[PDB]
Design an enzyme around this catalytic site. Structure first.
Site, short mmCIF file in Angstrom:
data_model
loop_
_atom_site.label_atom_id
_atom_site.label_comp_id
_atom_site.label_asym_id
_atom_site.label_seq_id
_atom_site.Cartn_x
_atom_site.Cartn_y
_atom_site.Cartn_z
N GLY A 30 40.27 37.32 38.19
CA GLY A 30 40.78 36.66 39.37
C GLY A 30 42.26 36.98 39.42
O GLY A 30 42.79 37.62 38.51
N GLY A 32 45.95 36.95 38.80
CA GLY A 32 46.68 36.45 37.64
C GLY A 32 45.82 36.25 36.40
O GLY A 32 44.79 36.90 36.22
N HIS A 48 42.03 45.16 32.46
CA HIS A 48 42.27 45.71 33.79
C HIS A 48 43.62 45.18 34.29
O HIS A 48 44.42 45.93 34.86
CB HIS A 48 41.14 45.31 34.72
CG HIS A 48 41.27 45.85 36.11
ND1 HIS A 48 41.60 45.05 37.19
CD2 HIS A 48 41.08 47.09 36.60
CE1 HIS A 48 41.61 45.79 38.28
NE2 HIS A 48 41.30 47.03 37.96
N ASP A 49 43.88 43.88 34.07
CA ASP A 49 45.15 43.30 34.48
C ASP A 49 46.27 44.06 33.76
O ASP A 49 47.24 44.50 34.38
CB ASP A 49 45.24 41.81 34.09
CG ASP A 49 44.47 40.88 35.04
OD1 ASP A 49 44.66 39.66 34.92
OD2 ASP A 49 43.69 41.36 35.89
N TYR A 52 46.93 47.38 35.26
CA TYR A 52 47.69 47.31 36.51
C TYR A 52 49.15 47.03 36.21
O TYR A 52 50.04 47.53 36.91
CB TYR A 52 47.12 46.22 37.42
CG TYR A 52 46.07 46.71 38.40
CD1 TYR A 52 45.20 47.75 38.05
CD2 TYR A 52 45.94 46.14 39.66
CE1 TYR A 52 44.22 48.19 38.95
CE2 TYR A 52 44.96 46.58 40.56
CZ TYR A 52 44.11 47.60 40.19
OH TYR A 52 43.13 48.04 41.07
C1 LIG Z 1 30.76 42.34 37.67
C2 LIG Z 1 30.91 40.84 37.25
C3 LIG Z 1 29.42 40.24 37.14
C4 LIG Z 1 28.12 40.91 36.45
C5 LIG Z 1 26.77 40.36 36.66
O1 LIG Z 1 26.60 39.77 37.87
N1 LIG Z 1 25.84 40.43 35.82
C6 LIG Z 1 24.50 39.87 36.06
C7 LIG Z 1 23.45 40.92 36.51
S1 LIG Z 1 22.08 40.53 36.79
O2 LIG Z 1 22.01 39.53 37.93
O3 LIG Z 1 21.52 39.91 35.56
O4 LIG Z 1 21.36 41.77 37.19
C8 LIG Z 1 31.84 39.78 38.09
C9 LIG Z 1 32.13 38.36 37.31
C10 LIG Z 1 33.39 37.71 38.06
C11 LIG Z 1 33.81 38.90 39.03
C12 LIG Z 1 35.41 38.97 39.39
C13 LIG Z 1 35.87 37.60 40.12
O5 LIG Z 1 34.96 37.34 41.25
C14 LIG Z 1 37.39 37.64 40.50
C15 LIG Z 1 37.79 38.90 41.44
C16 LIG Z 1 37.18 38.85 42.92
C17 LIG Z 1 37.62 40.13 43.76
O6 LIG Z 1 37.04 40.06 45.10
C18 LIG Z 1 37.15 41.46 43.08
C19 LIG Z 1 37.75 41.57 41.60
C20 LIG Z 1 37.37 40.31 40.67
C21 LIG Z 1 38.36 40.54 39.42
C22 LIG Z 1 35.75 40.26 40.34
C23 LIG Z 1 35.23 41.63 39.55
C24 LIG Z 1 33.68 41.40 39.35
O7 LIG Z 1 33.05 41.28 40.68
C25 LIG Z 1 33.31 40.16 38.31
C26 LIG Z 1 34.14 40.57 36.91
CA LIG Z 2 43.38 38.89 36.77
CL LIG Z 3 41.97 40.31 40.77
#
Ligand SMILES: C[C@H](CCC(=O)NCCS(=O)(=O)O)[C@H]1CC[C@H]2[C@@H]3[C@H](O)C[C@@H]4C[C@H](O)CC[C@]4(C)[C@H]3C[C@H](O)[C@]12C
Ligand SMILES: [Ca+2]
Ligand SMILES: [Cl-]
Ligand SMILES: [Ca+2]
Ligand SMILES: [Ca+2]
Ligand SMILES: [Cl-]
Ligand SMILES: [Cl-]
Length: 124
Positions: A30, A32, A48-49, A52
């Site tokens: 998210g 920060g 990743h943070d 960046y």
């Molecule tokens: C890819 C991640 C989730 C993986 C997942 O859903 N596994 C389950 C799969 S399954 O159903 O069992 O097939 C999600 C978890 C929280 C997400 C993050 C959060 O939503 C916070 C921000 C939101 C921004 O729009 C995009 C970057 C981001 C930094 C997101 C990157 C990514 O979409 C994350 C890291």
């Molecule tokens: Ca962050």
């Molecule tokens: Cl972010």
């Protein structure tokens, strides 16, 4: 750019939840972040943070409103495989690389529901 990072993630994790963009995860996923990552997934985000942050420190690069997320690049997706375009300029290649690595990292980490919208002010 941010929207490309999201598509990159869809590319690596087809079964991602579209509504997930409304929530935060762990201590670093998210805008920060604070303290230390609570799990693998969270670590991927912290890294990743950090990536960046290094981008913002590149002497030859300065992004719109100082936000690397505004920098759009070029990349392709094939069979959940991500490839950054060599034609990207140095700043864009650095950002595209951070996104690609994070997406790959996300695809290998476990998703722990208890960390969704974590009480960061208390556990981070
Ligand atoms: C890819 C991640 C989730 C993986 C997942 O859903 N596994 C389950 C799969 S399954 O159903 O069992 O097939 C999600 C978890 C929280 C997400 C993050 C959060 O939503 C916070 C921000 C939101 C921004 O729009 C995009 C970057 C981001 C930094 C997101 C990157 C990514 O979409 C994350 C890291
Ligand atoms: Ca962050
Ligand atoms: Cl972010
Ligand atoms: Ca500039
Ligand atoms: Ca660009
Ligand atoms: Cl500028
Ligand atoms: Cl610029």
């Amino acid at each position: 750019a941010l929207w490309q990072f999201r598509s990159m993630i869809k590319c690596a994790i087809p079964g991602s939840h579209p509504l997930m963009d409304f929530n935060n995860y762990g201590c670093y996923c998210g805008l920060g972040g604070s303290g230390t990552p609570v799990d693998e997934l969270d670590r991927c985000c912290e890294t990743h943070d950090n990536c960046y942050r290094d981008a913002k420190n590149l002497d030859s690069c300065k992004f719109l409103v100082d936000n690397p997320y505004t920098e759009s690049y070029s990349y392709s997706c094939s069979n959940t495989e991500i490839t950054c375009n060599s034609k990207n300029n140095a700043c864009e290649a650095f950002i595209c690389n951070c996104d690609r690595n994070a997406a790959i990292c996300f695809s290998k980490a476990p998703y722990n529901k208890e960390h969704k919208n974590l009480d960061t002010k208390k556990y981070c």
